Amino acid sequence: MTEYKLVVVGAGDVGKSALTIQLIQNHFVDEYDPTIEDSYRKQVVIDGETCLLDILDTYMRTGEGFLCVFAINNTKSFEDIHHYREQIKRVKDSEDVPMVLVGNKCDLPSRTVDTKQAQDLARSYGIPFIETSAKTRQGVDDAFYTLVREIRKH
Numbered sequence: 001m002t003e004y005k006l007v008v009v010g011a012g013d014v015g016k017s018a019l020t021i022q023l024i025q026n027h028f029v030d031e032y033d034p035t036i037e038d039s040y041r042k043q044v045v046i047d048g049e050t051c052l053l054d055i056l057d058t059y060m061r062t063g064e065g066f067l068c069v070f071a072i073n074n075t076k077s078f079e080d081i082h083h084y085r086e087q088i089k090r091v092k093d094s095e096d097v098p099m100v101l102v103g104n105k106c107d108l109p110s111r112t113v114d115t116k117q118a119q120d121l122a123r124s125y126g127i128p129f130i131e132t133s134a135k136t137r138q139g140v141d142d143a144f145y146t147l148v149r150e151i152r153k154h
């Protein structure tokens with residue numbers, strides 16, 4: 001079937017790796033042990049088109065579409081997403097590159113990125129915003145299938 005090369009980007013401990021795992025083994029890890037594989041893959045169905053997801057946990061010119069991740073519990077990571085999109089679309093000679101902004105760590109009650117704040121950042125960058133929590137799985141599948149449609153409708 002069709003295969004889609006997604007890479008997860010973002011700042012430190014935002015939960016890039018942690019997002020992946022939950023997507024692949026439907027489980028929430030509390031600490032990765034310094035990089036093992038970094039490049040998993042999963043068979044899924046999206047609207048009948050069953051297809052494969054090659055997730056690269058962070059060369060990435062290969063990437064087809066990108067999830068940009070910031071944790072909502074610290075605003076530095078959320079400021080750094082400009083630096084990422086600006087670099088995603090750098091090594092890609094196109095301001096058009098399938099992309100999803102995801103805010104992680106929703107069970108955390110001391111949030112410091114307003115849900116509006118992302119929401120507006122997203123629309124200004126043209127992309128969609130999803131909120132996730134690898135610990136409670138909420139919208140972890142959601143944020144990935146979104147990216148896959150942003151690649152197919154591209």
Ligand SMILES: Nc1nc2c(ncn2[C@@H]2O[C@H](COP(=O)(O)OP(=O)(O)NP(=O)(O)O)[C@@H](O)[C@H]2O)c(=O)[nH]1
Nearest residue numbers: 012013014015016017018029030105106133134135
């Ligand atoms: N409460 C909560 N903690 C989360 C959530 N997602 C990730 N974390 C935690 O945040 C920490 C960072 O996870 P990790 O996947 O290593 O983040 P990372 O982006 O891979 N960090 P690094 O850039 O060092 O590889 C982990 O210990 C994980 O338990 C979430 O939704 N809720």
Ligand SMILES: [Mg+2]
Nearest residue numbers: 016017057058
């Ligand atoms: Mg990681």
